[PDB]
């Protein structure tokens with residue numbers, strides 16, 4: 001359960017980071 | 026570069042949590 | 051779109067924290 | 076107090092994101 | 101249980117950060 | 126510098142986790 | 151101690167934003 | 176505009192955290 005929660009959080013941060021990276025592209 | 030590094034770290038964290046989730050199963 | 055995802059992320063976080071808070075109450 | 080602070084912080088963030096989502100309409 | 105897995109994860113992350121600090125220098 | 130700051134946050138988390146872990150010990 | 155750590159995180163955020171603000175100036 | 180607003184908000188947050196840190200001691 002906690003692993004799942006951590007994965008969801010990391011996935012959100014990764015998508016956020018990706019949109020920032022694309023904005024700077 | 027900052028956003029890219031954060032995206033990479035977050036994707037590694039997500040993979041690591043997924044692996045833990047699959048192991049805990 | 052960014053704002054909407056951030057709000058969803060935060061709601062999920064609040065729900066997790068609330069659960070923790072309730073366990074400690 | 077830790078969990079309660081975390082809950083308050085998450086709820087604050089959710090409120091701010093929601094206000095932002097509404098403004099961006 | 102939860103705290104021990106969280107301490108272990110946090111230590112791994114700190115080591116990864118430290119490695120990156122040394123590589124970047 | 127970012128890696129250094131990441132490291133401090135990670136160390137902070139690990140010590141908070143250890144304090145909880147010791148109370149559960 | 152938690153408030154002191156939160157202050158440090160907020161200061162880091164402020165410096166990061168200031169960096170961006172200056173480059174955008 | 177965005178970076179300036181983020182800087183302002185982070186500074187507000189830091190002052191709040193500092194005030195709390197001083198109240199607690």
Ligand SMILES: CCCCCCCCCCO[C@@H]1O[C@H](CO)[C@@H](O[C@H]2O[C@H](CO)[C@@H](O)[C@H](O)[C@H]2O)[C@H](O)[C@H]1O
Pocket residue numbers: 127128130131133134158159161162163164165
């Ligand atoms: C990878 C992300 C990590 C998540 C957060 C981890 C942060 C770890 C501690 C950072 O250290 C802080 O760095 C700030 C910025 O370098 C400094 O503020 C500096 O800049 C502020 C912003 O104006 C001023 O208010 C301060 O006086 C000035 O010291 C502050 O003193 C220092 O303690």
